[PDB]
Amino acid sequence: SPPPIRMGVDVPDRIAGVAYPQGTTARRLAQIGAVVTHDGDTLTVTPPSWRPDLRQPADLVEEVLRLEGLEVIPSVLPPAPAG
Amino acid sequence: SPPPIRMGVDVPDRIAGVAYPQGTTARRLAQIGAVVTHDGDTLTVTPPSWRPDLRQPADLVEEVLRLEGLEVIPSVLPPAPAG
Ligand SMILES: [Mg+2]
Numbered sequence: 001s002p003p004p005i006r007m008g009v010d011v012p013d014r015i016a017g018v019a020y021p022q023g024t025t026a027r028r029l030a031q032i033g034a035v036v037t038h039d040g041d042t043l044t045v046t047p048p049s050w051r052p053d054l055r056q057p058a059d060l061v062e063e064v065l066r067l068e069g070l071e072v073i074p075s076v077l078p079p080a081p082a083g
Numbered sequence: 084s085p086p087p088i089r090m091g092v093d094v095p096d097r098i099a100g101v102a103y104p105q106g107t108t109a110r111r112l113a114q115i116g117a118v119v120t121h122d123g124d125t126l127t128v129t130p131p132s133w134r135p136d137l138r139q140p141a142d143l144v145e146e147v148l149r150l151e152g153l154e155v156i157p158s159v160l161p162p163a164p165a166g
């Protein structure tokens with residue numbers, strides 16, 4: 001198995017900008033074959049042996065977001081920086 | 084005396100963007116001749132008879148800000164949206 005990855009439970013929610021229903025991250029990561037454990041608000045995710053591409057929290061975020069569907073991500077223009 | 088005015092104790096701070104020391108608003112408003120009573124966090128301000136220009140909380144805000152000095156107000160860029 002690849003080494004375990006520590007990641008906050010709401011990290012996919014923050015990066016997506018969507019408040020997913022609770023347990024979405026844990027369910028999706030378990031769906032793709034990873035072992036997920038809880039420690040307060042921090043998950044420890046061990047990817048399956050056939051997923052060496054999952055090495056960082058960003059890799060896990062893509063798994064949750066693509067399975068939930070990028071279409072649910074709202075179009076929110078960022079504020080204009082003083083250019 | 085003009086009618087009394089109700090105003091939050093920190094309203095001058097919010098409009099100025101400056102955290103004034105405690106009691107600044109009450110001290111400045113009593114300085115210019117108004118009667119100030121405290122009801123928790125809400126100030127009741129009765130301006131003196133020679134100040135018929137003090138009718139709204141914004142008027143009291145100007146009194147506090149101008150006496151503390153507009154030079155203490157910092158320079159912060161507003162959150163303009165994408166145009
Ligand atoms: Mg990936």
Ligand SMILES: [Mg+2]
Pocket residue numbers: 136142145146
């Ligand atoms: Mg005025």
